[PDB]
Amino acid sequence: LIVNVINGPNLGRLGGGTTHDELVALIEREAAELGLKAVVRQSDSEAQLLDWIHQAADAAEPVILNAGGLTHTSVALRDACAELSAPLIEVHISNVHAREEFRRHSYLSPIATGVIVGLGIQGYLLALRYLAEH
Amino acid sequence: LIVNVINGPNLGRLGRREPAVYGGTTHDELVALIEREAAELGLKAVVRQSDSEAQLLDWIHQAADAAEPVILNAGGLTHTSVALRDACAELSAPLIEVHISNVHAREEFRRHSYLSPIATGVIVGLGIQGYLLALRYLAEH
Amino acid sequence: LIVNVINGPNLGRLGRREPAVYGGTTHDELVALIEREAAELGLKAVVRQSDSEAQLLDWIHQAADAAEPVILNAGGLTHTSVALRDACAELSAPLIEVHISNVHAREEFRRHSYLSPIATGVIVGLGIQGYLLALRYLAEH
Amino acid sequence: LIVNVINGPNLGRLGRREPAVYGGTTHDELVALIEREAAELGLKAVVRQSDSEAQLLDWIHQAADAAEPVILNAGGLTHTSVALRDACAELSAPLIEVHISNVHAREEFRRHSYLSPIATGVIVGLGIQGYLLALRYLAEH
Amino acid sequence: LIVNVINGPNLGRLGRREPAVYGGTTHDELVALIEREAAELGLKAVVRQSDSEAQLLDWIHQAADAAEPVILNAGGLTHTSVALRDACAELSAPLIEVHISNVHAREEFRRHSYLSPIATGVIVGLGIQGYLLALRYLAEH
Amino acid sequence: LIVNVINGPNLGRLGRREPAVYGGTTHDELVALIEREAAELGLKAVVRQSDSEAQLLDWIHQAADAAEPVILNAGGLTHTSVALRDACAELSAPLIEVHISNVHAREEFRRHSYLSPIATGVIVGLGIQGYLLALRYLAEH
Amino acid sequence: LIVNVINGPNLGRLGRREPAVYGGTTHDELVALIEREAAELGLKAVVRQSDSEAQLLDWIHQAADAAEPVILNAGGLTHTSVALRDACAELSAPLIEVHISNVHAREEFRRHSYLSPIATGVIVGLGIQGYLLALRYLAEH
Amino acid sequence: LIVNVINGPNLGRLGRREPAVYGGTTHDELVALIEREAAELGLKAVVRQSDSEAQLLDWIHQAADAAEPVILNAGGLTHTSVALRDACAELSAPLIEVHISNVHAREEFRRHSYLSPIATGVIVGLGIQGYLLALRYLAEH
Amino acid sequence: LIVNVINGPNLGRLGRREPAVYGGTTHDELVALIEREAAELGLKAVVRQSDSEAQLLDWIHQAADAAEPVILNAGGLTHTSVALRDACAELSAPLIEVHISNVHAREEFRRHSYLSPIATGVIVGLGIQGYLLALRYLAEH
Amino acid sequence: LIVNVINGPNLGRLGRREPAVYGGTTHDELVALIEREAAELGLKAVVRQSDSEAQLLDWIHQAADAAEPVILNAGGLTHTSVALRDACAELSAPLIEVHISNVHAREEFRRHSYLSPIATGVIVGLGIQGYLLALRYLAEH
Amino acid sequence: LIVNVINGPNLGRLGRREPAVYGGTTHDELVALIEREAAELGLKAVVRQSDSEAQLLDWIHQAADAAEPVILNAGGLTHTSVALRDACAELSAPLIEVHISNVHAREEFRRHSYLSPIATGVIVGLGIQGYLLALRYLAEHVG
Amino acid sequence: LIVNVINGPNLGRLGRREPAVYGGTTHDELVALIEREAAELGLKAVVRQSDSEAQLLDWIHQAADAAEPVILNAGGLTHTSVALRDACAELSAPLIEVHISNVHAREEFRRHSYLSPIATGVIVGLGIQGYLLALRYLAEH
Ligand SMILES: O=C(O)c1cc(O)cc(Oc2cccc([N+](=O)[O-])c2)c1
Ligand SMILES: O=C(O)c1cc(O)cc(Oc2cccc([N+](=O)[O-])c2)c1
Ligand SMILES: O=C(O)c1cc(O)cc(Oc2cccc([N+](=O)[O-])c2)c1
Ligand SMILES: O=C(O)c1cc(O)cc(Oc2cccc([N+](=O)[O-])c2)c1
Ligand SMILES: O=C(O)c1cc(O)cc(Oc2cccc([N+](=O)[O-])c2)c1
Ligand SMILES: O=C(O)c1cc(O)cc(Oc2cccc([N+](=O)[O-])c2)c1
Ligand SMILES: O=C(O)c1cc(O)cc(Oc2cccc([N+](=O)[O-])c2)c1
Ligand SMILES: O=C(O)c1cc(O)cc(Oc2cccc([N+](=O)[O-])c2)c1
Ligand SMILES: O=C(O)c1cc(O)cc(Oc2cccc([N+](=O)[O-])c2)c1
Ligand SMILES: O=C(O)c1cc(O)cc(Oc2cccc([N+](=O)[O-])c2)c1
Ligand SMILES: O=C(O)c1cc(O)cc(Oc2cccc([N+](=O)[O-])c2)c1
Ligand SMILES: O=C(O)c1cc(O)cc(Oc2cccc([N+](=O)[O-])c2)c1
Secondary structure, three states: OEEEEEEOOOHHHOOOOOOHHHHHHHHHHHHHHOOOEEEEEEOOOHHHHHHHHHHHHHHOOOEOOEOHHHHHOOHHHHHHHHOOOOOEEEEEOOOHHHOOHHHHOOOOHHHOOEEEEOOOOHHHHHHHHHHOOO | OEEEEEEOOOOOOOOOOOHHHHOOOOHHHHHHHHHHHHHOOOOEEEEEEOOOHHHHHHHHHHHHHHOOOEEEEOHHHHHOOHHHHHHHHOOOOOEEEEEOOOHHHOOHHHHOOOOHHHOOEEEEOOHHHHHHHHHHHHHOO | OOEEEEEOOOOOOOOOOOHHHHOOOOOOHHHHHHHHHHHHOOOOEEEEEOOOHHHHHHHHHHHHHOOOOEEEEOHHHHHOOHHHHHHHOOOOOOEEEEOOOOHHHOOHHHHOOOOHHHOOEEEEOOOOHHHHHHOOOOOOO | OEEEEEEOOOHHHOOOOOHHHHOOOOHHHHHHHHHHHHHOOOOEEEEEEOOOHHHHHHHHHHHHHHOOOEEEEOHHHHHOOHHHHHHHHOOOOOEEEEEOOOHHHOOHHHHOOOOHHHOOEEEEOOOOOHHHHHHHHHHHO | OEEEEEEOOOHHHOOOOOHHHHOOOOHHHHHHHHHHHHHHOOOEEEEEEOOOHHHHHHHHHHHHHOOOOEEEEOHHHHHOOHHHHHHHOOOOOOEEEEEOOOHHHOOOHHHOOOOHHHOOEEEEOOOOHHHHHHHHHHHOO | OEEEEEEOOOHHHOOOOOHHHHOOOOHHHHHHHHHHHHOOOOOEEEEEEOOOHHHHHHHHHHHHHHOOOEEEEOOOHHHHOHHHHHHHOOOOOOEEEEEOOOHHHOOHHHOOOOOHHHOOEEEEOOOOHHHHHHHHHHHHO | OEEEEEEOOOHHHOOOOOOOOOOOOOHHHHHHHHHHHHHHOOOEEEEEEOOOHHHHHHHHHHHHHOOOOEEEEOHHHHHOOHHHHHHHOOOOOOEEEEEOOOHHHOOHHHHOOOOHHHOOEEEEOOOOHHHHHHHHHHHHO | OEEEEEEOOOHHHOOOOOOOOOOOOOHHHHHHHHHHHHHHOOOEEEEEEOOOHHHHHHHHHHHHHOOOOEEEEOHHHHOOOHHHHHHHHOOOOOEEEEEOOOHHHOOHHHHOOOOHHHOOEEEEOOOOHHHHHHHHHHOOO | OEEEEOOOOOHHHOOOOOHHHHOOOOHHHHHHHHHHHHHHOOOEEEEOOOOOHHHHHHHHHHHHHOOOOEEEOOOOHHHHOHHHHHHHHOOOOOEEEEEOOOHHHOOHHHHOOOOOOOOOEEEEOOOOHHHHHHHHHHHHO | OEEEEEEOOOHHHOOOOOHHHHOOOOHHHHHHHHHHHHHOOOOEEEEEEOOOHHHHHHHHHHHHHOOOOEEEEOHHHHHOOHHHHHHHOOOOOOEEEEEOOOHHHOOHHHHOOOOOOOOOEEEEOOOOHHHHHHHHHHOOO | OEEEEEEOOOHHHOOOOOOOOOOOOOHHHHHHHHHHHHHHOOOEEEEEEOOOHHHHHHHHHHHHHHOOOEEEEOHHHHHOOHHHHHHHHOOOOOEEEEEOOOHHHOOHHHHOOOOHHHOOEEEEOOOOHHHHHHHHHHHHOOO | OEEEEEEOOOOOOOOOOOHHHHOOOOHHHHHHHHHHHHHHOOOEEEEEEOOOHHHHHHHHHHHHHHOOOEEEEOHHHHHOOHHHHHHHHOOOOOEEEEEOOOHHHOOHHHHOOOOHHHOOEEEEOOOOHHHHHHHHHHHOO
C-alpha cells in the first residue's frame, strides 16, 4: 500500500549532504525494498500540506510528515492530522532538543503515533519500516 | 561493534503491566529480539535493565571508556536525572534515547527530557520496534 | 444588507469528522442553512471557506473596504495568527467570532484567541447554530 | 417549558449609568424583555438577580433538581468562584454562559473563566440580546 | 469534648450527584454517621453545612473563641477564599482540612489550597471516612 | 457631609486577637475613634462591618448613588473579589483603600489587590490611624 | 490479610532528630506501634524502610504482584521521583500517601508531589498517627 | 524630634511637568507645605531631594545613626533598587514609603516595590498630601 | 548591488487604516520613495509585498541564492513564524528587520520577534523612514 | 538646532576592547564622527557620555526643558532603570534609543528595555552607524 | 581533627573526561591533594565518592552522628535531590558546598541548588582549589 | 602582583549592623585583615569602598586597563546591575565574586546574580574569611 511522505517549509532547500530530489529517490527505492509505495511531496505552504493531509485521511493512508517549523506553530496542521486513521510518524532530520528552546515543543507530537528526531535522512527510512507492519 | 542497550527503572516490569501503553512483550523477550536482530545487522548487543540510578551511571561510564554506542531508555529518570545527563554527555559514540510509548500524548511532565538535548537523537511512540530501528541506524553510523 | 461569513482551515471538511465535537452536517449543508436563514431576515449572506490564511486575509480586506459585517470562524488560525487579527482590527462594521465546539473545554491552548480582543463579540460551543445566532444580532444592528 | 435566567453581582445596577460598556437598559426592562421573547418562543422565563453567591448557588441547585436549563451571567464571580462552577457542573439541561460586555477586550484577568469549561457554550459582547440568542438556542435544542 | 465539623458550599448536594467521585451517602446521613462516631470516641460532634461564606466565617469565629477543634471541608472555597483562611488562622485548637475526593487527581486548580498551610493536617481522597479518621486524631490529642 | 467607612471580612474581630499584628483596640473602639475624628474635620462618618460579600456590595451601591466618599478595608476580599472591584469602579467620589497591617511584609498573595487600580489611594501599614489619616485626606479633597 | 508500609529516605532516623517537626518516636518504636495496631484491626503490617530508590521500587513491585495494599511515605522522593510515581501507578490495591509533617506549611517545593495524583488518598501532617489512620481506612476499604 | 523627608530621582521636577498624575504643586511649594505642617505638629522635618542613589544612601545612613524616622519617595528606585532597600532595613525608627500618584493604576511594573516590605507603612495616591499624612503619623510613633 | 525589500501581511494597507499608528503614506508611495533613495545611492531596490508565508519564504530563498541583502518587514509573521526565520537563517548577505510602528509601545505580544535574533540589525518606530535608513546602512556595510 | 546624543555606562570604553561586538572606533573618535555628521545635515550635536545615572537624568532634563531631540544609548541601564524611563517619558521632542550591537542575539535579559515603550523609535544592531542614521531621521520628522 | 569530604554522581570521572571545564586532574589525584593539604593544616580528611544516592545519604548521617564537618560536592544531585537536602539539614557542624565549574556560566537548571540554602557557604568555579579553601575555612575557625 | 578589592553599596556600614548576618568586624578592620593576609601571601592589595555605581565602574575600568585581578562584593548591585556586569566582562585577570552572607538562605531575589555568570568564581556566606580565601586563590594564579 501507499505511504505519504510530506515535507514542510524550507525542506526543498535540503543539501545533511543530500538534496531533496536525492531524498525522494532514496525514500522510493527503500519503500520498494518493501511492499510499500512511497509518495514524496514537498511544499512551503500550510494550505498545501493541509490539502495532502486531507487527501490521506480520505484515503486512510499512513503519513510521515516532517512539517518544518510549523511543527512548532501550526494548530491548523494539528487539527487536520487528528482525523488520520492510519499511523502518523513525525520526522525531524536534526535533533530539535539540542537547539533553541522553542523547538522543544510540537503541536503534532501529541497526536502522532510516534516521532523520530535527530537521526538525519535515515529518519525517513526508519519510519517506513515501522509502517511496513501496517 | 558492540552496542549497549540500557534500560532504566520499571523496565524490568513489562510487559507484565499496562499492555495498552507499554506493549505486552516481556523484558526477556525484548533482550532476545534486540540480540537476534542485531546479529542480523552484524553488531553484538549487550542489553541490561536496572532500577538503580547508580548502576546505569556505571554502565554509561563503561560505554564511555570503551567508546561504544548507546541505546538508552532511562524511563522515569528521563525526566528527573541531571546526574544521568552528565554521564551521557561524556559519550563520543552515538547515544539514542528510546521511548516505547508516546510521551507527548500523556502527562505534560513527560514532554520534558534532560537527555534529549544531549543525544544524537530520540525515538518515541514506536513500541518495542523502537529499539531495533535504533540498531539499524547505528548499523551505519 | 450583505454579510460575509468566513470559515478558516479544516472547516470545509465539517460533517466528515468527529460528530461528537463538530456535529454531522456538511459544509455544503451549512451555507444552505446560513443563506436561507439570512433571507428570513432580509440580508444576503456570502459564505466562504479557505485553508489559506492569505486567502482569508484577502476576504477580510474586501469586507473592510465595503464596510460589511463579518462573521468569522477562523479555526486553527484563531490561536495563532496575529496577521489575521491585524486584518480584522481594520473592520469598521461588527465582527463576530464564532466557534462550533466549546474551545474552553479542550486542550488548554485553544483557550486563548488573538481575535476576541478586537471582535464585537464571540459565540462558542453553540454548534452550527452559533452562525445563525450571529446573523441576528446583525439583522438588529 | 421553564428556562432559568440568572444574573450575578452588580447586574441590578444595569442601565442606571455605566452604559459606555453595558448599555442604557435597566434590569426590570431586561426582565420584561427576556419574558416578552421567551413567551414568543413557547418557553417560560424565570429571570432572577442576586449579589449573593449563596443565593445564586441555591437557585442553581433547584434548576439541577427541576432538570431545567440555566442561562447565567455571573458577573464578577465568573472569574473567581469554583463553588459556582461546581454547582453548575451537576446541571443536566444545557447551561449557557453569557456576558453583556466583550470580556476579551478589557483587563487580562477578565479573560479567564471557571464556568466556560463546564458549560455548553458562551455568548460574549453581544449586549443584552446575548440573552435572547441563548433563548433562541434552547428553543431549537 | 466538643468538635466542630463544618462543611462548605455544595456539600449539601452530596448524595445526589456523581456517585463515582463524592460517594453515595447523602448529607444528612453524613451528619448522622459522624455524630454516632464522635460519641463512640467520647466526643460531641457539632456538624454544620452552609453555602454562605459569611455563615462559615461566623462558625469558625465561635470555634476560635471557645477554643474548640475544627474539622473543615471548605468545598470550592478551599482554592479561593483568603477571608476563610484568615478566619481559620486564629483557631487555638487543632484544625483538620478534609476532602472526600482526591483533589490532586483532578483539575490543576483543585491542587492549590489556602487552608492547608495553616492547618494541623490534611486528609484527602479517603472518601467520607476522612471525617471519621479526623475524629480519631482529635480523640487522641 | 457623609463619609462611608466600610470593613470587610474578619474586621468584626479586631482587637479580639493577634496583639502585635493588628493591635488591642476593638471594632467598637475603632467606630468611636473614627466618629470623633470625623466631627473635628467637618465630616459625618458612618462605619459599618460585614463578613458578607453581598452586604459590602449593597453598601457600595448606596454610596455610588449618594455620591459619597468611601474608606474601605475589604480584608480578605481585597485579594480575591472581582465583584467588589466592579461595584467600587462605579463611585463618583474618592475611594481610599485602607489596611491596618503592612500587607507587603507578609505572604506573597497579600501583596496584590483588585481594589487599588480603581482606588484614589491606598494607605497601608499605618495601623488604626490609616482610617483617621484617610479622613483627613477627604477633608481637604 | 497483608498491608505494606513503606518508608523512604531519612525516615530511618525518626526521633533521632527534631522532636519539633516529627515525633519523638524512633523507627523501631514505630514499627512496633504499627504492627500492633495492625493486629488489633485484623491485618498484617510489614513495615520497611530504605534510603534507596531502587529498593523502594522493588518493594512496590512485589506488592503489585501480591495485589496487596501500600501505605507509602516516600520522603523527599515524593517531590522528585517520576520513577517512584510510575511503579505505584501499577498497584491494584489502594495506595495511600502519608506524611508525618504538614508539608503545606513549609518550602513551596514541598507542596508538590508526583505521587498524589495516582493515590487512593493522602494523609498529611498528622504525625505518627497518620499511619494508624491509614490502616483504619484499609481495614474498611 | 527630627523627621527626614527624602525624595528620589525625578522628584525635583514636580509641578514642572504633568499632571495629574503628579499634581500642580512644585517641589519648592512642597518644601514650604512640609515646613508649615511640621510647625503645626510641633516637630522638625528636613526635606532633601537627589537624583543620585549614593546620595540617598548617605542620607539614609545618617538617619540610621541619628535614630530618626524617614519618609521616603524614592521615585524610579522603588522598583529596582536593592541597594536602597538594604540601606533602609537598618533604620530603627519608623519608615513611611510615600507615592504621589496611584502606582496601582499604571504599568504592572509599578505595582512592585523593594521598599514596602521593610517599611513601617505605605501611603500611595493621595498626591502631595501623602507627605503631610505621614508626618502626622510620626507625630505618634 | 541589488537590495530586496520584502514586507509581509497587511503591509499593502498602509493607510487606508490607523493614520496615527502606521502613518499617512501608502505602499505605492513607499515604493517610489525607496527607489529615489536606492537610485540616490547607486543601488537597485526590488520592493515586493505579499500576504502569503509561502511567498515570502520563496523570495527569501532566492535572495539567499543570489546572495542579496534583504530589508524585511514581516508585519505579524514576525511574532509567529519560525519557518520564516529558518529561511532568513541561510541569508549570507545582511538582513535588516524593519517596523514602521514602535512595537514596544503596543500589546506585549508585539514585543517578541522570532526574526530579530538572526537579523543583522533592527529599526523600529521611525515610520516609513525606517526602510530608507536601512538602505543607507546597506550602502555603507 | 541642537540634538543631544547621550551615552551611558561603559560607552567611554568603546574600542578599548572587545573587537568583536562593538567595533574598532573609540568613544573619542565617535564623538567627532557624529559632530561632523550632524553639521553636514545642519544639526548641531552635543555628545556626552557618563557612567552616572544622575548625570544622565540631569541631561535628559535639560533636553526636556529645551524641547530638544535626544539619541540615547543608555547601555546597561536600558534593562534596569525605571528612573531613566520617567526622565525620558517627558521629552516632547523625538527620542531615539540606539544600541550598537544586536541585543536580540545575546542574553535574553538584554532583549527587554524599559526605554523602548517611551522612545519614538529604536535602532539596534547597526553598529556605530546607528547614531548616524538617527541624526538622519531627526533632520526631518 | 576530622573533615568529611564527599563527592556525588560523576565526580569519579573528574579530569578523566572531558574538559577544560573541570580541569585535568583525576579524582584519585584530588583525594591526594585534599589529604596532604588537610595534613599541612593539622587536619585529617576522609574523601569519598559515590554515584549512589543511598551511599551519599549514608555518609551524611554518619557525619551528622559524629558531628564532623562535611565539605560536599553533590554533582548531579545538587540540582535535583530533596532527599539529600533533608539529610544535610541535620548537620550541626559546618557544611560547605563546593563546585569545580562555574555553574552560573552554564545551563539555567544548574544555577539552582536545593543544598545552598542550608549550607554554611558555597564555593563555585574556583576549580579543584574550591575544596582546599573550604579546608582552610574550617581550620581558621577551630577553638 | 596587585589585587583590587572592590566593595559596593552599604558595605561601609559593615560591622555596625545585624552581625547576625554580616558579622561584627568593621570595614576599616577588614581593610587591615586583608592588607596583612595579602602581605604574607606576597601580594599588594588595594581595598576600596563606594556607594556609587559610577565610582565602582570607574575602579573596574582601571583594573581592566591595568590587567589586575578583582575581588568584588557589589552588595545590592549584584542582583540589579547590568552596567556593573558589563564592566566586569571586560577584565582579563580572574574575577572573584564575594558575599559575606549566604544569599541562598535569605530572600529569593538575592538568589540571582548578574555577575556570577561572568566571574571566574563565587565565594558565598563563609563570612569575612571569604575575601581572604579569594586572596589565597589568586596567589596560586
Ligand atoms: O527536520 C528538522 O530537523 C527540522 C526542524 C525544524 O524546526 C525546521 C525544519 O525545517 C528546516 C529549517 C531550516 C532548514 C531546513 N533545511 O531544509 O535546510 C529545513 C527542519
Ligand atoms: O518507554 C517509555 O515510553 C517510557 C516513558 C516513561 O516516562 C517511563 C517509562 O518507564 C516505565 C514506566 C512504567 C511502566 C513501564 N513498564 O515497563 O510497563 C515502564 C517508559
Ligand atoms: O469551530 C471550532 O470549534 C473550532 C475550534 C478550533 O480550536 C479549531 C477548529 O478548526 C477545526 C479543526 C478540526 C475540524 C474542524 N471541523 O469543523 O471539521 C475544524 C474549529
Ligand atoms: O456581563 C458582563 O460582561 C460582566 C462581566 C464581568 O466580569 C462582571 C460583570 O458585572 C458587572 C460589573 C460592573 C458593572 C456591571 N453593571 O451591570 O453595570 C456588572 C459583568
Ligand atoms: O470533598 C471534596 O472532595 C471536595 C473537593 C473540592 O475541590 C470541592 C468540594 O466541594 C464540593 C464541590 C462539588 C460537589 C460537592 N459535592 O458535595 O457534591 C462538593 C469538595
Ligand atoms: O488580607 C489582608 O492582608 C488583610 C489585611 C487587613 O488589614 C485586614 C484583613 O482582614 C483580617 C484578616 C485577619 C485578621 C483580621 N482581624 O482584624 O483579626 C482581619 C486582611
Ligand atoms: O514524613 C514527612 O512529613 C516528610 C516530608 C518530607 O518533605 C520529607 C521527608 O523525609 C524526611 C526528611 C527529613 C527528616 C525525616 N525524618 O523522618 O527525621 C524525613 C518526610
Ligand atoms: O510618587 C510617585 O507617584 C512616583 C512613582 C514612581 O514610580 C516614580 C516617580 O518618580 C517620578 C517620575 C516622573 C515624574 C516625577 N515627578 O515628580 O515629576 C517623579 C514618582
Ligand atoms: O505586529 C506588528 O508589530 C506589526 C508592526 C508593523 O510595523 C507592521 C505590522 O503589519 C501590519 C499590521 C496591520 C496593519 C499594517 N498596516 O500596513 O496598516 C501592517 C505588524
Ligand atoms: O550599545 C549596545 O549595543 C549595548 C547593549 C547593551 O546591552 C549594553 C551596552 O553597554 C555596553 C556594555 C559593554 C561594553 C560597552 N562598550 O562601550 O564597549 C557598552 C551597550
Ligand atoms: O563541581 C561542579 O562544578 C559540578 C557541577 C555540576 O553541575 C555537576 C557536577 O558533577 C559532575 C558532572 C559531570 C561531570 C563531572 N565530572 O567529575 O567530569 C562531575 C559537578
Ligand atoms: O555580603 C553579602 O553577602 C551581601 C549580600 C547582599 O545581597 C547585599 C550586601 O550589601 C550589604 C547590605 C546591607 C548591609 C551590609 N553591611 O555591610 O552591614 C552590606 C552584602
